[PDB]
Symmetry: C4
Subunit: 451 residues, 4 copies
């Protein structure tokens, strides 16, 4: 039994570092600053030299146009090689051409209360597929004023903060040189390309680094709720498109192929309650998903080669970016669970044999104990979402309310804005919540001390 356990043990052991190698391998070291520099160059810089606001600060259409005609242009251009080629920082190819896309909602999408109909001329509803405006508004001279479809326009429907956004919409592709772009943008500002009915806009472009080999894909996402104002959001994604430069990369490629053999091996083992079975399956399921993504999704790299043919177009990476994220997402989770699988054998046989007997024993009862606090914990969350959420960003969404309470329990708090929101309940809420939580838990010890 021991040697058989030892075999599945050492097999697991090899499988460990192999994955650890891939992770450590597939992740370059200094990538962070590559983002941070990009981010600070765009997000963090004053909209205009005379302006005190960053991109994170944009409150208005005027704010937006300033930014577009502002640092964004200067952020995307340098002198400096073609000279149509502009190296960012001097170190970064601006890859292809940037693209701007917006969304628009129809006039009569909404309805005016009968009393104010004599007053109000028209309204514009919150964005929806139904409320989508496909009419060719404006001079209709270009894709800016001409509607297109996410089928026709290669792209993936994106999930925004207030709503999901279909890839389709009104878009425009920029120019190679800063001057030509400004000419385009000006017309887009001159003629009104941002009107009452424009809910969300996209600015997307890709950037390549030649020093280390990586691709920076940038999604600048600006929303315009029916309430007006501006909600800026951004995405900076590094990507490794070309897997082969160094032999070390080729060294990793063999590993992944070898890594596939392990999974192939474990899959057979899965054939036949149990908890660790329920645990082990999770590891395998995630594993398969990654590779499938890794191959028939990510290994495509068509758009690249397609872009490599003619580099004057827009190199849509949104999918490729989107997926490798999920890939990075999944793979990370696997490793996490991979470390967890360590316990069942090396610890249970000797060390935690005196623990698991207590651990798994109470683990059944722990379910019964933990029932009480959540309901209470959820109640405040629901309460706070009702009282607050019209006031404090932290309570804006019911989800974030839950998250906020953890920060509260851990001590991260903005108390002032709470008291500003409600001079009465908020303090009461804050106190009672914190108060009961301890008082609640202390009882649970006792019913645990029952044993």
């Amino acid at each position: 039994y021991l040697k058989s356990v030892l075999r599945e043990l050492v097999t697991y052991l090899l499988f460990l570092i192999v994955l650890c190698i891939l992770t450590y391998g597939m992740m370059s070291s200094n990538v962070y600053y590559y983002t941070r520099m990009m981010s600070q160059l765009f997000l963090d810089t004053p909209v205009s030299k005379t302006e005190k606001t960053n991109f994170k600060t944009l409150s208005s259409m005027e704010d937006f146009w300033k930014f577009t005609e502002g640092s964004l242009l200067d952020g995307l251009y340098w002198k400096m090689e073609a000279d149509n080629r502009s190296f960012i920082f001097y170190e970064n190819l601006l890859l292809g051409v940037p693209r701007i896309r917006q969304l628009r909602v129809r006039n009569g999408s909404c309805s005016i209360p009968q009393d104010l109909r004599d007053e109000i001329k028209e309204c514009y509803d919150v964005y929806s597929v139904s409320s989508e405006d496909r009419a060719p508004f404006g001079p209709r001279n270009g894709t800016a004023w001409i509607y297109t479809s996410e089928k026709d326009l290669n792209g993936s429907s994106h999930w925004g903060i207030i709503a999901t956004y279909s890839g389709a919409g009104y878009y425009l592709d920029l120019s190679r040189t800063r001057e030509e772009t400004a000419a385009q943008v000006a017309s887009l500002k001159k003629n009104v390309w941002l009107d009452r009915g424009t809910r969300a806009t996209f600015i997307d472009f890709s950037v390549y680094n030649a020093n280390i080999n990586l691709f920076c894909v940038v999604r600048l996402l600006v929303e315009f709720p029916a309430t007006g104002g501006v909600i800026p959001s951004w995405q900076f994604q590094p990507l490794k498109l070309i897997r082969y430069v160094t032999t070390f990369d080729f060294f990793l490629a063999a590993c992944e192929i070898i890594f596939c053999f392990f999974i192939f091996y474990y899959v057979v083992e899965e054939i036949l309650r149990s908890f660790w079975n329920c645990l082990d399956v999770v590891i395998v399921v995630l594993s398969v998903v990654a590779i499938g993504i890794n191959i028939y999704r990510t290994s495509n790299v068509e758009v690249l080669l397609q872009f490599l043919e003619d580099q004057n177009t827009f190199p849509n990476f949104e999918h490729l970016a989107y997926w490798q994220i999920q890939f990075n997402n999944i793979a990370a989770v696997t490793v996490f669970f991979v470390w967890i699988k360590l316990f069942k054998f090396i610890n249970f046989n000797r060390t935690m044999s005196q623990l698991s007997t207590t651990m798994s024993r109470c683990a059944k009862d722990l379910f019964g104990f933990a029932i009480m606090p959540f309901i209470i914990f959820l109640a405040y969350a629901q309460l706070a979402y009702l009282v607050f959420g019209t006031q404090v960003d932290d309570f804006s969404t019911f989800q974030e309310c839950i998250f906020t309470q953890f920060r509260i329990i851990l001590g991260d708090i903005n108390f002032a804005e709470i008291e500003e929101a409600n001079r009465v309940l908020g303090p009461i809420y804050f106190t009672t919540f914190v108060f009961f939580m301890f008082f609640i838990l202390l009882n649970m010890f006792l019913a645990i001390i029952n044993d």
Copy 2:
């Protein structure tokens, strides 16, 4: 017994989601940003273009006048439809006309010490109903200089941060167009409409949004303590005045009527110690209060219809705003307790039968244990209020002192200003407090471990 318990159970179950529907229904999703944009447009913007202060920063009369003649004007006007109609952000009707009101205290309200009487000419006491100045000061040409009564002037006495303020006072109603208003304001600054004896001022106006159907009521409240300086405060209240637009709204209306039947049903059940009885009554009491507010208070909507007749006046919503707050306040609390009522049945019968037996058992003793820390906890609070409260905002009020200590226990702290306040006791206070609290609790475990 079980089926009878099952009936009161499923009955409770239906009553749950019905309320959940109403809450989820009566609360729109994106309302938060509607406030946030409004707030950031007023509270968060520089008083003047050359000025570095926000509305939250106002320290002086000069600060105030700048703000009034500053962003406030520009915040209330846009171009843009009448053109007397100015859409905020282009998306928001400025509803009716804004109104400014101030309070004033009589000359001899206070008394000078005999020694300095030769020095000081006059004083002005802290605001009170007695100290109220009803004399028609100044040119006496308008409501600005003419006192009016909260009976005559429709309004609700408001509860400020240092004091309650009667609705009566000296007020002025603005104009439709920004220019005419500035003319008014200038005269109010030219002639001195803010003098030694002006304790508190009000700026109130309402804003309607046509996209989603809502009303933003704004209370800008500025105080002037007898000590001078300025204490800014603000209120941004969304309101749903017209309950019927979508059929979904009509769907909710039937629910509330149906919802009333439940309460009517439970009221009869209340007829006849007990804790859960003491619990259940609370649910019912709050429930009734809400609906009464919901009907003969809020459903009035007279001022609206009154305003809808002639829109050039000031549409006082202060009550309507004030109440629906309380309504939102109460309803939220109900839901909270509604979730709590879950425990007594589903959990007690099976799961917490092994818990409630311990829970309710120690719940009696917990009262005896918890006595010790509060007295100690209160002592520091009272101590801190004596030592501090002349120094640190967090200790300014005895109430907030209590709240401050929680942040301290949870770790939210400004230590510097404390040490700045008192280089000696504060650190001692801070250390000892934190120190004993743990040391105190640890003992309480033992007397609990006694069982």
Copy 3:
């Protein structure tokens, strides 16, 4: 026994609220903002209109002179009644005349290493009574350039942040009007009144409020370590000098006299281990000290009456301010202990009879348990003071190091500057400290669980 205990009980009860009345009585409500406005007017305002620094920011002599010739002047003057009388905010008498005093250290106070003697001409040692420079430097035309003694110059030696400072030194008294003062200050800047050897400067003045009856005493304390630079510090003290205006004040006066009778009563009771005896004595001792301060120290009020004769001089309140602080300090502590005396009787007889038996029992052992962590806790404190304290303000002083660790345990942390200080030990220090502390305590439970 019970009635006898009941008598000492109700006697204690009356004594409670009597003190509570005095405290609540002797403390006015809104005093806080009176300070806050004063503070924000001076500490918080830009040194110059073109300048971005506050008084808290001053790094240099130039910084200082700017401040003096800057906001300070404008902060002390308004238009506005005499007109030699300038009401601050229009609400506050500038009381008497402000005063500036500095300290100076002799040339050869220090000694140069023999190697650099050929290089360096002279040095100036850290401030000390020995290093004090009494020589009449400069043009010697005024108290600015003429040394005076704290005996001759009425004043109390003050305890600064790096050192205690004798009241004696070089001082100058300002003028009534802003213009005349600037003339003085300019000469003090024109001629060099701040030289290499000036360690510390004082700016002190008093301000009276006529609305509520109070006195604001302001100590602006600037230090110049031998290392150069500037360490600003400030003191804003409210004072109630005239105890009699309202009959309510007279109502309080009788109480304090009545309050004295209680102490007189308890003193006799003290005549005769015990803990509560050791407790009770503390209450009495502090009590006596307060009244003695209250009478033959504070009730003096001579300087006032002296100032009231001729108001053109400097009204030194430093003592009067200094003492009532200590008075407020002591009285607060008393109340704290007063609440503590509640336990021994009402709780011990019924409620905590089941607690004190455990409480006082383990209270002996708690001493033995708590020994271990302090030594460890102190060690890190001493360690951190060695590693840090040349880097992080929080560790600058060994005292503050201790305080810093509490914030760390409670979660208030600046981690960045720590890692900036030492990329190695700091993180190690931080981790290990936090780590052991929990690990340490958990053991202590067990030896407590021993019972």
Copy 4:
């Protein structure tokens, strides 16, 4: 046995304060501000008068040159004695001459993917000893353009934040007067001395204070990752070079010599498991290392005397600085352990005899218990490093990830940027992590309660 234990006890006792004296002695009091003033003068000041960025803010080459030609120059010069001698603050000798050094990487150090070779002309790899560029680029007129070796150029290879940096490189030594330096710097900017291939630059200079006797050594370290941008870092080190000024210093010198006798005494005692043996050895080992550093490393002081001959050169203290740090590092650790050695005797004999019996008993089992959380704690750390670390600075390095989680557990958190990084996993990560950690620990109590 007791007297023998008493002898080793009192011997230890004397050894305690002797060290305490040395520490307290070897550390001057006010040193902190000496740094803080220096730091704030350089790190904290706007690059240019019109500029809003500090040295900590530098994002670019342009940023850098501005700083060099900016505050740095003004920070290093004052008027003021020679006049070639410029006293900083007027209180600080600029010691010798400052020095600037940079690093450079060869052209073909890296390799371009075959597809973009037609596009990209050249790349520059991340810094390495191999990638080092020793070619004499540029006009080759000076050490700026002429490569030198760390053998030839006296210096110690320094450990930077992204990489270790050999002392060798391209350097330049500044002038005595600000004007001459600017002439040098301009040429270095005029001609391009910062190119694509410059990874890291050094600015190093020393500053002496004559008031207290100390030396400030300044290392300004700027990095340029292959990704572009700028990573500023700084080091401000006080040093006591001349050990003899006051007799008190001579008093300390005898102590250290006497202090050596103790160690000499304890070394013999070490001759012969045990834990305290394992403890005691550590104390001795560290002790020896310090003195060896103290003598044949630090007591050298040659460069000083060498510099004292001719003061126009660059006084390299980098080693002397580097070592005394380690010295201060080690000595601090010793004291920490010195306090720890207290327990084994005074506490074990009487007080903790009732504790150590429990302490050391469970101390064996504690190892078994603590196994579970670390693996879990590490997992999140590894997970977070995979998910984050491309986004959040706090997760940038796997090491800092661990540190970040402590702040999270203690409550120090930036939640926003996390949610900004990943709208999904981050919140999930945050919640689950915090959630399990408590849930994990609670079980461990039970298996501990097993006893």
